[PDB]
Structure 1
Amino acid sequence: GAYKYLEELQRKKQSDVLRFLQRVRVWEYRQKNVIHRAARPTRPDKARRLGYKAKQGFVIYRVRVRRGNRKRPVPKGATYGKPTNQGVNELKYQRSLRATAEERVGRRAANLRVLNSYWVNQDSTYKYFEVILVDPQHKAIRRDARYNWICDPVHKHREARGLTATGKKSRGINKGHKFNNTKAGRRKTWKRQNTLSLWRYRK
């Protein structure tokens, strides 16, 4: 098969072929809009292992996100508090840029459900992603049970509750001694260990 060759070509990104293709594609994507439809995935191996079964009702969007730190609001850089919480510039935004891209293309296409998303390109000013949205009420998805779970009403806006592939990363969810503050979700395992458990017969 021909996907191992694309996988191994895409793992070598500073070679001459991929940096020429990087430059041509970063120009081409910068000439278009921020959120715009991609007719066809540019990384069919990497789209395909995230879940892109190429048939009717699968949609690729391509999206730029503005790159860099999160500068705070609070006008003229004054925070009106302690000198601890007084920095304006170097704040750094707990979600990824890939999560911002997924949320934006899930707000434009609002009938569609975001499955995953992957990196396609970057320059100094922007990062460019392709998001792999699934249309859940098309009849090629509402049956053939490998993909009808996205039809369920609990999966509305996966990208804005942290349930995509970068959501559960940037929520800190994994197994381990390393992920103790956030393993069942951070705020439930905060509230359950600042709960005062009091019984009927006081233990």
Structure 2
Amino acid sequence: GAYKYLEELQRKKQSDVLRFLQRVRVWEYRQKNVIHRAARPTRPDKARRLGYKAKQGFVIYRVRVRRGNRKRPVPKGATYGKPTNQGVNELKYQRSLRATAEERVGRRAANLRVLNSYWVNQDSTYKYFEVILVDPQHKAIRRDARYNWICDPVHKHREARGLTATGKKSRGINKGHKFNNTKAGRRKTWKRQNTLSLWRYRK
């Protein structure tokens, strides 16, 4: 297919043609509302390899975020404590902005289940993404096997809990020695290993 040529073109984000396209598209999306249904994706290849299939039930919404550090919501720097919790400006929010965006559209429209999201465009001021949704009420979904796992009540709001790509990434899930803390659940680990376990015949 041609999706491969499309990928390989995408992965050169500094060519003049992409510079142009980027400028047009970012201006367009910036004129648009912060959240808007898109008729169809801007990177169909990307959506397709993250599981989009052009059919009755799948949806794209495009999204903006506001792109900076997360200034502490504290009146005038009045944090009321020790110097270490005295910072406000240079603080970073642990969830990604992609995660935020996904969360915000999932809140906008709650009948649907998220699947994934992806970068499209940005500037200094904003970041733009395109986000993938499903109506699990849809008969097409429920009758196709291959996705209907998402119809399950378990996968409700899987962006809200940290179960997408970005979710599982920021939540520290990956194998190995650099993830010993927070691989199978941070709080789970800490709880496990701050618990005192005591048997009947004491060991």
Question: TM class by shorter-chain length?
Answer: over 0.9
> In proportion to residue count, which structure has more helix?
2
Deviation per CA, 1:99-135: give whole Å up to 9, x if none: 0000001000110100000000001110000000111
Cα distance in 1, alignment partners of residues 52 and 177 from structure 2? 34
Deviation per CA, 1:36-67: give whole Å up to 9, x if none: 10000000000110111110000000000010
Cα deviation for residue 71 of structure 1 reads 0.1
Cα distance in 2, alignment partners of residues 98 and 89 from structure 1? 21
Cα distance in 2, alignment partners of residues 5 and 133 from structure 1? 26
Gaps in structure 2 of 5+ consecutive residues: none
- Match of 1:115, SS state, is strand
Cα deviation for residue 2 of structure 1 reads 0.6
Q: Percent identity?
A: 100
In the alignment, which residue of structure 1 is the partner of 2:123?
123
Cα distance in 2, alignment partners of residues 82 and 98 from structure 1? 32
Gaps in structure 1 of 5+ consecutive residues: none
Deviation per CA, 1:110-163: give whole Å up to 9, x if none: 101000000000011100000001111100001111010010000000110000
Cα deviation for residue 78 of structure 1 reads 1.2
Give TM-score, length-normalised by structure 1. 0.99
Deviation per CA, 1:142-195: give whole Å up to 9, x if none: 111101001000000011000011000000110000000011010001101111
Runs ≥4 in structure 1, deviation > 6 angstroms? Answer: none
In the alignment, which residue of structure 2 is the partner of 1:111?
111
Cα distance in 1, alignment partners of residues 88 and 71 from structure 2? 6
Give TM-score, length-normalised by structure 2. 0.99
Cα distance in 2, alignment partners of residues 185 and 98 from structure 1? 21
Superposed CA RMSD: 0.5
Cα deviation for residue 74 of structure 1 reads 1.6
Cα deviation for residue 75 of structure 1 reads 0.6
- Match of 1:94, SS state, is coil
Cα deviation for residue 73 of structure 1 reads 1.1
- Match of 2:120, SS state, is strand
Cα distance in 2, alignment partners of residues 160 and 65 from structure 1? 17
> In proportion to residue count, which structure has more strand?
2
In the alignment, which residue of structure 2 is the partner of 1:16?
16
